[PDB]
Amino acid sequence: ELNADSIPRLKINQQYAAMGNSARNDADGQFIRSNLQEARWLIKSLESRNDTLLRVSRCIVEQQQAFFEQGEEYMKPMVLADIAQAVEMHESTISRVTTQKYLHSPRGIFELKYFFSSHVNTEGGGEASSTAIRALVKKLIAAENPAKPLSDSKLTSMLSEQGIMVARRTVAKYRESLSIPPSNQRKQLV
Amino acid sequence: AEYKDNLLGEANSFLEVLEQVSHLAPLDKPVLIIGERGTGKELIASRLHYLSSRWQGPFISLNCAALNENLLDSELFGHEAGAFTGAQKRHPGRFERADGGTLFLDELATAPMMVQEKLLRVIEYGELERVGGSQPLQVNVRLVCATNADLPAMVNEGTFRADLLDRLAFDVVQLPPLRERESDIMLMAEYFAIQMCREIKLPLFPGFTERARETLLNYRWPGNIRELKNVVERSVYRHGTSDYPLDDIIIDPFKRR
Amino acid sequence: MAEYKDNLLGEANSFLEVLEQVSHLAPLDKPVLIIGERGTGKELIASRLHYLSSRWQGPFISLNCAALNENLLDSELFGHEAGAFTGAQKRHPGRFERADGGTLFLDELATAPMMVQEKLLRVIEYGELERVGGSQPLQVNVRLVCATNADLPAMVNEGTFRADLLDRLAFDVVQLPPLRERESDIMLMAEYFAIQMCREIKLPLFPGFTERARETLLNYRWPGNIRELKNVVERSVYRHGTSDYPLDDIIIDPFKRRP
Amino acid sequence: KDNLLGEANSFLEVLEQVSHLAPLDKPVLIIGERGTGKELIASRLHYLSSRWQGPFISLNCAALNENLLDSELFGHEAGAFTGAQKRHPGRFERADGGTLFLDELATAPMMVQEKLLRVIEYGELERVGGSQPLQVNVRLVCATNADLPAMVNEGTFRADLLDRLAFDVVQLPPLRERESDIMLMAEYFAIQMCREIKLPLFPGFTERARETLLNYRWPGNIRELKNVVERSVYRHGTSDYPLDDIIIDPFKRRP
Amino acid sequence: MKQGLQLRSLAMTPQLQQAIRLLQLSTLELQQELQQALESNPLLE
DNA sequence: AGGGCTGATCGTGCAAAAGTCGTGCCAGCCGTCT
DNA sequence: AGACGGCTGGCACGACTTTTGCAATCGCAGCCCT
Ligand SMILES: Nc1ncnc2c1ncn2[C@@H]1O[C@H](COP(=O)(O)OP(=O)(O)O)[C@@H](O)[C@H]1O
Ligand SMILES: Nc1ncnc2c1ncn2[C@@H]1O[C@H](COP(=O)(O)OP(=O)(O)O)[C@@H](O)[C@H]1O
Ligand SMILES: Nc1ncnc2c1ncn2[C@@H]1O[C@H](COP(=O)(O)OP(=O)(O)O)[C@@H](O)[C@H]1O
Ligand SMILES: [Mg+2]
Ligand SMILES: [Mg+2]
């Protein structure tokens, strides 16, 4: 549901709308008509932004319902072109106006780009993403000895066991993205 | 994972075919068929796609018949921009339809031999033959076929070049004839009786006379499943039929008075 | 330089010598033609020459001859766009125009229209550019590749192929060792495909080859040279069985109804 | 504007015909088999024509787009359903006294034939949706591989084309007919080839097979001559590569 | 299928383009911009 | 008296140069057991 | 008491995104310039 209270409403001054036609002066009427045209263009722009946002949001929530329900660990690889193809979303107006949209859902507060998760490989016609990988790596590092955290190689093994097949290079890279100490640096005396 | 919908495939050979499909399911290669008429083959193809349970949609579903002009199935490998007249942006379609998927080849034998050659040329290397000047692009997707057409016959005919014919040789399926299947036929008959009673939500499944099932057997039954589905609604068409069992099955839509 | 053959499914009999001749012929860019049978390594030979696309910048251009439907095929030759056709768009040059200098792999279909082949041949002979319009042909060199899948001088007699196009074509042929001819790595490339199949299956281990199976392999007419051999290889691999038996039954004719 | 002269007395007389015609702009035909080099001679006339600094550039008769035939010689001015641009005239409009060798005339549509039959009319260039035609003088020239009378008995080209036939189509002598500098032509072609072959010189050389090649079909005067020359050379590629046992049989099964 | 005649629009640039560019902005970015714009117009509410 | 010339209107994209992530890849480093 | 070893982050390339920078010729006819 679009935040209609957070959705501004553009009202036209109807008193000016009734005070211009009677203007026997052409300059006042022309200025009023130009102002009305500009205001109508602006209001239509805001409304089109809202409507396209609602449509793409429905498409993403359909795509990210698994991300909405199970969470970032089950965040599917979501892209604009795929979403635009899936929901018949704008081919370029969407790419423009996609910036700065936020949503409150059972998962929490999520950005517009936060809904779209990157693409990662999965065999057997399955598919994989990025936020999924981040949450899975967080769990795997949690599923490590308190004295010895999970290795980036161990994280790669865990990802491959999950079928993610992140491999050690992306495993270390995402652990850097997750900003956690891996095995030989998170090592602590038991 | 995802479970394929129930199919009345009670033939023991049908179970065997299902098993063969099951073995092939982890595999990923061409899948052809003998295309028995009135026989619900691409339903089995879907059960395959379902058996694969691939993420996203790999169960493309398009025939060849509507591709009357060569351009149509030609546009199964669509157009990019401005080749001929661009009626809409990125005329490409039906190709990425199984982006990471598989293709269902229906009405395949009717396809143009030039069209067939184009398809085969796509098969191995995977190059995107987009009409209009551009660069190709592969995609890891598959294909599958099912047709009453006799492949050895067409090879004698040379309707498609032999290269493609062999290129397709990775999994065959000879569906049993409608006149071949009898016990499964009556089983699915009761099944469709119940299924109609459900979908229409009519208060009572009327039943059918023993004479009703016997006469339906005496019916031509050219399509074991496709004809049966039409007969199902044909009896469902009758009003008050649900209240009491009746043998009123409407074969001919043109039948009247 | 030299790039490792990603596949060298080659015949020690004379496709060794054939490959040697190809390597000798490779450096120049003059007319390049081949010859072969239904599914007889000829795409693989195309890859051979594409590796033999010497140095770098080997722009692989494919000419799937029996494609292009009917109508705009003409444009696919020359170049679309401008305001010309039912549309208007930027200069999508013809497929030959699209690749400048590239490798022109002929699909050995033998086009029904000699004039259409002749129009391609005139552009193939030289490119003077199309400064008038993209509807025309342009000023492009290209490596060019041909092959044979049928009887050339017969069609010359059969009038199927224009003599002038034939005279320009086949400056140096490349025939192929058939399944009825090559017959060299039959068991060798056979187990090669077998290992590929096992690795694809992630298979435990190769059960082996039956002497009856090997005898059948020798006896095979092999209607398709390269692939159909690999085809039956895949056929047996899918047929599969216990690791106890090295090989069972014949996969030469999958078409045959399953027992 | 020259090449590896076949060095023939017939060639001498044909060149004489060309030179006699040189100033003239009359439409011209030719019936030359592949390797004849009549096109090369034609363009040699074009550069050597009275209009030495003239716009002389051919366009294969086979080229034209199925519907763009009007858009072939004439060129788009306004409308045409494009809805934009389409303001560029035809290369034939781009001619104006220049040359466009009517190659491939052996196969153009009877439709193409009649449209050109209009082009055979003196001047009057009409374009799409036009106001006033253009009487644009242009030099006409063509060559064919076959017999104009043969087509005529077939009726293949309308006799309008025969009217379009204007200048006496000189014809290239057959390979068996030409037989002029076969060793010398081989010598020049092989000089060029070894240049491309980058080998030093033909230490083998020899000429018994040169006379053997004098007993050759030679279907293309330059199409096959040099073609077989290079075929044999590349099969050799060695310094000591003589005229002995070098065959022209690329289709044939070598051993 | 082939080519002949037949076949046949356009968008707007600058003013429509500026209006569209205003929407790619943030929510409160659009709100403050709307306030600043409404500061001028005598025919809006 | 004849030519220039004027814009009042003409509005949901894209494209383009740029940037930026994914994944890899690689190089030194420290705990330690040798 | 120096090498193993995984860290761990620097470095890399393309691959997906992306933001901005972009409006007209209408249309006559009267007015201005010539
Ligand atoms: N298990 C099933 N459930 C629902 N519909 C079915 C089932 N099996 C077959 N059908 C129906 O039968 C019709 C034709 O089936 P089929 O004979 O496979 O087609 P074809 O004539 O191409 O072989 C299809 O429209 C399909 O809806
Ligand atoms: N070593 C190999 N590596 C890859 N493919 C091979 C190999 N040996 C045989 N094949 C297969 O055999 C076939 C070669 O024949 P191909 O060139 O496709 O047929 P055609 O001659 O009709 O064009 C292909 O299907 C190819 O994949
Ligand atoms: N006098 C010549 N010197 C060198 N090469 C020639 C000569 N005449 C013809 N050729 C060769 O003939 C080829 C052109 O073929 P051509 O004879 O024009 O075919 P056609 O006559 O059927 O149009 C060119 O590659 C050119 O090298
Ligand atoms: Mg069917
Ligand atoms: Mg010629």
Instruction: Map C213-242 to HEC letters.
Output: HHHHHHHCCCCCCHHHHHHHHHHHHHHCCC
As given in the structure block, the two tokens for residue D137 are 């003088």
Question: How big is the CA angle at D19 (ends D18 and D22), to the nearest 5 degrees?
Answer: 85
CA pseudo-torsion sign B162, B163, B166, B170:
negative
As given in the structure block, the two tokens for residue D163 are 């009217």
Give the chain D residue nearest E4 (alpha carbons): D67
The angstrom resolution of this structure is 6.8
Among C177, C192, C198, C191, residue whose Cα is nearest residue C241 = C198
CB C150 within 8 A of CB C108: yes
Alpha-carbon gap, residue C179 to C191, rounded angstroms: 17
List the C81 CA – F4 C1' distance (angstroms).
38
Cβ < 6 Å from ligand 2: which residues? B 163; C 7, 9, 36, 38-44, 226-227, 230
**DSSP string of B204-246, one letter each residue:** ------HHHHHHHHHS--SSTTHHHHHHHHHHHHSSSTTTS--
With a 6 Å cutoff on the Cβ, whether D173 touches ligand 3 is no
Tokens 């339903």 sit at which residue? B43
Q: What is the DSSP letter of A106?
A: S
Total length of chain B: 257
Please indicate if the annotation marks B101 as binding a ligand: yes
The CA dihedral of D199, D203, D204, D207, to the nearest 10 degrees, is 110
Max Cα separation, chain A? 90
The number of C-alpha atoms within 13 Å of B30 and in the hemisphere containing its C-beta is: 19
DSSP reduced 3-state for C163: helix
- Write out the residue limits of the CATH 1.10.8.60 domain(s) in chain C: 180-259
Alpha-carbon gap, residue C106 to C64, rounded angstroms: 7
The beta-carbon neighbor of B54 closest among A76, A85, A125 is A125
CA pseudo-torsion sign B66, B72, B73, B77:
negative
- Write out the residue limits of the CATH 3.40.50.300 domain(s) in chain D: 3-175
As given in the structure block, the two tokens for residue B183 are 């016990």
Tokens 């919908």 sit at which residue? B5
Alpha-carbon gap, residue C156 to D255, rounded angstroms: 23
Alpha-carbon gap, residue B22 to A189, rounded angstroms: 52
Among D27, D42, D30, D47, residue whose Cα is nearest residue D164 = D27
Alpha-carbon gap, residue C222 to C225, rounded angstroms: 6
Tell me how many residue pairs between chain B and chain C have CB atoms under 8 A apart.
101
Provide the experimental method for this PDB entry.
cryo-EM
Give the chain C residue nearest E7 (alpha carbons): C86
Question: How big is the CA angle at A137 (ends A131 and A141), to the nearest 5 degrees?
Answer: 150
The number of C-alpha atoms within 13 Å of B190 and in the hemisphere containing its C-beta is: 8
Task: Count the helix, strand and coil residues of chain B and give each as a percent rounded to the nearest 5.
Answer: 40, 5, 60
Burial B98-132 (b: 16+ CB within 10 A, else e): bebbbbbbbbbbbbbebbbbbbbbbeeeebbbbbb
Among D41, D20, D40, D57, residue whose Cα is nearest residue D139 = D57
CB D33 within 8 A of CB D174: yes
CATH superfamily of B6-178: P-loop containing nucleotide triphosphate hydrolases (3.40.50.300)
Alpha-carbon gap, residue B61 to A88, rounded angstroms: 20
Query: Could you check: is the Cβ of residue E27 within 7 Å of any atom of nucleic acid strand G?
Result: no
**DSSP string of B52-86, one letter each residue:** HT-SS--B--B-STT--SHHHHHTTS-B-SSSS--
The angle, 0 to 180 degrees and rounded to 10, between the axes of the packed helices C42-51 and C15-25 is 40
Sheet strands side by side (includes C101-106)? C60-63, C101-106, C142-145
**Which residues face B145 on adjacent strands?**
B105
Distances (CA, A) of D158 to A84, D32, D171: 58, 20, 21
Distances (CA, A) of D212 to B35, D182, D187, D248, D251: 62, 11, 15, 11, 19
- Cα(B159) to centroid of ligand 4, in Å? 19
How many other CB atoms sit within 10 Å of the CB of residue C59? 15
Q: What is the DSSP letter of C28?
A: S
Alpha-carbon gap, residue A24 to A20, rounded angstroms: 9
Alpha-carbon gap, residue C59 to C144, rounded angstroms: 11
How many other CB atoms sit within 10 Å of the CB of residue C178? 15
Q: Which secondary structure element, helix H or strand E, spans residue C105, and what is its range?
A: strand C101-106
- Write out the residue limits of the CATH 1.10.8.60 domain(s) in chain D: 176-255
Alpha-carbon gap, residue B35 to B41, rounded angstroms: 7
Q: Which secondary structure element, helix H or strand E, spans residue B41, and what is its range?
A: helix B41-52
Residues of chain C in contact with residue E6, where contact means CB-CB under 8 angstroms, are 86
Alpha-carbon gap, residue B25 to C87, rounded angstroms: 45
Report long-range pairs for B45-49 (Cβ below 8 Å, ≥24 apart): B45/B104, B45/B144, B45/B146, B46/B4, B46/B5, B47/B4, B47/B5, B47/B7, B47/B18, B47/B21, B48/B21, B48/B24, B48/B144, B49/B102
Task: Indicate the class that CATH gives domain C180-259.
Answer: mainly alpha
The number of C-alpha atoms within 13 Å of A23 and in the hemisphere containing its C-beta is: 16
The burial of D254, by beta-carbon neighbours within 10 Å (0-12 exposed, 13-18 middle, 19 or more buried), is given as exposed
Q: Which secondary structure element, helix H or strand E, spans residue C60, and what is its range?
A: strand C60-63
Question: How big is the CA angle at B15 (ends B9 and B17), to the nearest 5 degrees?
Answer: 105
**Which residues face C79 on adjacent strands?**
C93
Among D41, D28, D139, D141, residue whose Cα is nearest residue D94 = D139
Pairing state between β A109-111 and A102-104? antiparallel
As given in the structure block, the two tokens for residue A115 are 């809904």
CB C123 within 8 A of CB C139: no
Alpha-carbon gap, residue B94 to B86, rounded angstroms: 17
Chain-chain contact of C87 with E7 (C-beta, under 8 angstroms):
yes
Q: Which secondary structure element, helix H or strand E, spans residue A81, and what is its range?
A: helix A80-87
Task: Indicate the class that CATH gives domain D176-255.
Answer: mainly alpha
CB C77 within 8 A of CB C94: yes
Q: Nearest nucleotide (C1') to the CA of residue A41?
A: F11
CB B249 within 8 A of CB B241: no
List the A80 CA – F11 C1' distance (angstroms).
26
Contact with chain B for residue A85, Cβ under 8 A: yes
Amino acid at B235: S
How many other CB atoms sit within 10 Å of the CB of residue C154? 11
Amino acid at D71: S
As given in the structure block, the two tokens for residue C113 are 């229209």
Alpha-carbon gap, residue A167 to D155, rounded angstroms: 74
**DSSP string of chain D, one letter each residue:** ---S----HHHHHHHHHHHHHTT----B--B--TT--HHHHHHHHHHHSS-TTS-B----GGGS-SSTTHHHHS---S-TT--S------TTTTTSS-B--BTTTTS--HHHHHHHHHHHSSS-B--TT-SS-B----B-BB-BSS-HHHHHHHT-S-HHHHHH--B----PPPHHHH-SSHHHHHHHHHHHHHHHHT-S--SSB-SHHHHHHHTS--SSTTTTHHHHHHHHHHHH-SSS-BSSS----SSS---
- Write out the residue limits of the CATH 3.40.50.300 domain(s) in chain B: 6-178
> What architecture is the D3-175 domain classified under in CATH?
3-Layer(aba) Sandwich (3.40)
As given in the structure block, the two tokens for residue B83 are 């080749």
As given in the structure block, the two tokens for residue A176 are 């850097």
Alpha-carbon gap, residue A133 to A160, rounded angstroms: 11
CB B229 within 8 A of CB B241: no
Query: Could you check: is the Cβ of residue E8 within 7 Å of any atom of nucleic acid strand G?
Result: no
* DSSP E strand boundaries for chain A: 102-104, 109-111
Residues ≥6 apart with Cβ < 8 Å to D83: C88, E7, E8
Distances (CA, A) of C15 to C8, C51, C132, C178, D254: 10, 16, 47, 10, 15
The angle, 0 to 180 degrees and rounded to 10, between the axes of the packed helices A152-161 and A131-142 is 120
Max Cα separation, chain B? 66
CB D87 within 8 A of CB D43: no
CB B52 within 8 A of CB B94: no
Distances (CA, A) of C236 to A110, C248, E36: 53, 8, 76
CATH superfamily of C7-179: P-loop containing nucleotide triphosphate hydrolases (3.40.50.300)
Q: Name the CATH code of domain B179-257 (choices 1.10.8.60, 3.60.150.10, 1.20.1050.10, 1.10.760.10).
A: 1.10.8.60
Alpha-carbon gap, residue C20 to C26, rounded angstroms: 10
Alpha-carbon gap, residue B132 to C85, rounded angstroms: 12
Amino acid at D164: R
Check chain E for breaks (C–N over 2.5 Å) and list the residue before each, or none: 8
Tokens 């030959």 sit at which residue? C96
Please state the φ and ψ torsions of residue D191, each to the nearest 5 degrees.
Answer: -60, -50
Alpha-carbon gap, residue D205 to D181, rounded angstroms: 16
Chains that touch A (3 or more CB pairs under 8 A): B, E
Distances (CA, A) of C21 to B6, B72, B130, B170, C175: 60, 44, 36, 35, 11
As given in the structure block, the two tokens for residue A61 are 């929530």
Alpha-carbon gap, residue D140 to B125, rounded angstroms: 48
Nucleotides of F under 7 A from a protein CB: 9-16, 21-26, 30-31
Nucleotides of G under 7 A from a protein CB: 5-11, 16-24
How many helices (DSSP H) and strands (DSSP E) are in chain B? 9, 2
DSSP reduced 3-state for A171: helix
**DSSP string of E10-31, one letter each residue:** ----THHHHHHHHHTS-HHHHH
Q: What is the DSSP letter of B150?
A: -
Total length of chain D: 255
Distances (CA, A) of D33 to B107, C165, D237: 47, 11, 30
Amino acid at D38: K
Report long-range pairs for B68-74 (Cβ below 8 Å, ≥24 apart): B69/E1, B70/B112, B70/B114, B70/B115, B70/C69, B70/C70, B71/C69, B71/E1, B73/B111, B73/B112, B73/B115, B74/B115, B74/B118, B74/B131, B74/C69
List the A96 CA – G19 C1' distance (angstroms).
7
**Which residues face C248 on adjacent strands?**
none
List the A183 CA – F28 C1' distance (angstroms).
17
